[model samples]
Target: MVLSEGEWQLVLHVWAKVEADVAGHGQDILIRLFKSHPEILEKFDDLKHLKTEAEMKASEDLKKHGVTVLTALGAILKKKGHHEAELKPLAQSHATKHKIPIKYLEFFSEAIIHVLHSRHPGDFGADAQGAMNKALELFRKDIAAKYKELGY
Candidate 1:
């Protein structure tokens, strides 16, 4: 399935934001993810902390299970992450064709934040949530700009 240029740009923006958010403010992003989609955490067999190596490992394991499982996982991540629910199936199909997990390829903001916090502990501050919100807005604006570039 070919993505519209706007949609592809949105994917690129979300992917970039995921990397930045993880590198800059991971813990805060994870905390916000928990606050936004508390139930997603509940689905995990182990409910300890969001940024634990164990949780990250679990996510990786889930990814290995295949696109159907990962796409469902992406649904949970999408609540606090960067894409809309409508996009998951397409993302999943793309992942399957490419032989990557949909969750990893799509780069939902929530999982990136969790991985960031788990990998880098000290970079986060009190205002991280607000910063994340702003970051997401910036990414959306970037995608919107791409849409204009295409005369959409």
Candidate 2:
């Protein structure tokens, strides 16, 4: 779907704040992800069995992984039109090396939306949610296509 200029601006504006807010709260977001979707824990051998937020926060591996995930998300947000090209390699790697299912990426997208809504409750309304959903939908399709190409 082609996002309107207003929609693009809205998403970019919210994403700028999201990037900043998540810079320090990456673990919090990841914790939420695991809590909301425990199935995802199996994807990360190191992250499985992490019971507390404090434990997740203290793990350097979790922190680094969180940053890595967020950094890639930030890049995806910035490179909207070229997301397919930008995310292709990462998608291929995740599909081949990690054997991560495309559905897990959709869960990650939901996790991000959950974090943004929780972090800025008053700021997120239907319009913002729509923009985010559209952005993520496009991202999901792009990555899924690449994953399929990899014979997943």
Per-prediction TM-score, please?
A: 0.28, 0.90
Compared with the true structure, model 2 gives a TM-score of 0.90
Backbone clash pairs for candidate 2 read none
Question: Residue 47: error of model 1 in Å?
Answer: 30
> Cα miss at 110, model 1 (Å)?
2.6
For residues 1-152, write the lDDT of model 1, one tens digit per residue. 12344443443444344445332334344344445565544444544355554464455433333234334433433444444443444444433443333233224455545554565434433345434444445444443443344334
Per-candidate Cα lDDT values, in order, are: 0.42, 0.80
**Model 2, stretches more than 4 Å misplaced?**
none
Model 1 clash number: 0
Q: Which run of 10 residues does model 2 get worst, by summed lDDT?
A: 17-26
Segments of candidate 1 deviating more than 4 angstroms: 1-107
How big is the positional error of residue 62 in model 2, measured in Å on the Cα after superposition?
Answer: 1.0
